[PDB]
Design a protein around this ligand. Structure first.
Ligand SMILES: NC(=O)c1ccc[n+]([C@@H]2O[C@H](COP(=O)([O-])OP(=O)(O)OC[C@H]3O[C@@H](n4cnc5c(N)ncnc54)[C@H](OP(=O)(O)O)[C@@H]3O)[C@@H](O)[C@H]2O)c1
Ligand SMILES: O=C(O)c1ccccc1Nc1cccc(C(F)(F)F)c1
Length: 318
């Protein structure tokens, strides 16, 4: 039985520092993973409309609630609003599909998944005849206002953002009539992309950071053989052996010691358990400085390439 440390949000809700990520996987693979996770002691599950797999997650949580394995109040469920749904009637409609598939009556956190609004319509990745993304009418600011209504109505406990730079967080924070603040910024983070200035910024504003792709997302479709490889990184493995731990566990523990929430994904039961076995060791302050020095500003997750649209987050330094 395991329990992740709590990270307290500006709303005083407690966010488990390790969560289970839910990257697309067939078919009931993700459902069992959620079941296995809950068994092992995970309470934080990270979800997304775009994965189109949220119903599996829903079946899993439902069954474990009836089985009496877990209660709702102890689960910490996060999902996100995809950019093609920023227009106000769409926000509510996308959210409702999320909350339905998940068979919940509320989310602990609802995130803006990406800062740039995309063309509304059937496509989730609207593109021109030349491949480039098509912008939409509503902004992330427009979306946020609709999302704040969800909080007003007790459908969501707290809001946050994902893939935001500090310039975009600044715009959100300085928005007139702002009701609710982002409790987290979920972004890619690992030793090749250490996000030092952004984490500094968020924390200075009382906004937590959630590290995604902490293992380098090896299963990403667009990987290349020469794309650097965190899990196979000899200097990571060496630090691991020193603690009698796996490379994956070191990569996870790295965020924990920076006070950064982290959501490693696995549909393999042995790995799910292993990925939460990370509160029995501690990297030395010298091991942490060594890992921090691996920063090469490499993004595994930069597929969108809507660098032509307004509010592209990765143009910013941080
Ligand atoms: N924009 C966003 O907000 C955003 C973007 C990307 C990801 N995310 C979230 O973050 C989560 C995690 O990121 P990710 O899925 O991109 O990549 P990740 O967690 O860095 O890596 C997942 C991959 O590593 C494998 N793996 C898991 N544990 C392992 C272990 N102990 N040893 C060796 N291999 C292991 C998994 O394989 P098996 O599953 O086959 O075990 C899977 O292929 C996602 O599921 C999603 O929830 C959010
Ligand atoms: O997975 C995210 O959170 C994500 C975020 C921004 C851009 C792309 C993203 N990934 C994504 C989007 C659609 C389908 C799949 C895949 F099925 F490959 F997992 C992965």
């Amino acid at each position: 039985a395991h329990m992740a440390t709590f990270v307290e949000l500006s709303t005083k809700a407690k966010m488990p520092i390790v969560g289970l990520g839910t990257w697309k996987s067939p078919l009931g693979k993700v459902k069992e993973a959620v079941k296995v996770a809950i068994d092992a002691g995970y309470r934080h599950i990270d979800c997304a409309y775009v994965y189109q797999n949220e119903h599996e997650v829903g079946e899993a949580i439902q069954e474990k609630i009836q089985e009496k394995a877990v209660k709702r109040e102890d689960l910490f469920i996060v999902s996100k609003l995809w950019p093609t749904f920023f227009e106000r009637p769409l926000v509510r409609k996308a959210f409702e599909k999320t909350l339905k598939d998940l068979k919940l009556s509320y989310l602990d956190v609802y995130l803006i998944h990406w800062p740039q609004g995309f063309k509304s319509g059937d496509d989730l990745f609207p593109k021109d005849d030349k491949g480039n993304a098509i912008g939409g009418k509503a902004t992330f600011l427009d979306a946020w206002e609709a999302m704040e209504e969800l909080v007003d109505e007790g459908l969501v406990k707290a809001l946050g953002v994902s893939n935001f730079s500090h310039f975009q967080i600044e715009k959100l924070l300085n928005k007139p009539g702002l009701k609710y603040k982002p409790v987290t910024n979920q972004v890619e983070c690992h030793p090749y992309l250490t996000q030092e200035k952004l984490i500094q910024y968020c924390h200075s504003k009382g906004i937590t950071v959630t590290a995604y792709s902490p293992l380098g997302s090896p299963d990403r479709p667009w990987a290349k053989p020469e794309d650097p490889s965190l899990l196979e990184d000899p200097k990571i493995k060496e630090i691991a052996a020193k603690h009698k731990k796996t490379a994956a566990q070191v990569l996870i523990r790295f965020h924990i010691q920076r006070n950064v929430i982290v959501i490693p994904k696995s549909v393999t039961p042995a790995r799910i358990v292993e990925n939460i076995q990370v509160f029995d060791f501690k990297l030395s302050d010298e091991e942490m400085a060594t890992i921090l020095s691996f920063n090469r500003n490499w993004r595994a997750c930069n597929v969108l390439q809507s660098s032509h649209l307004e509010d592209y987050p990765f143009d910013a330094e941080y």
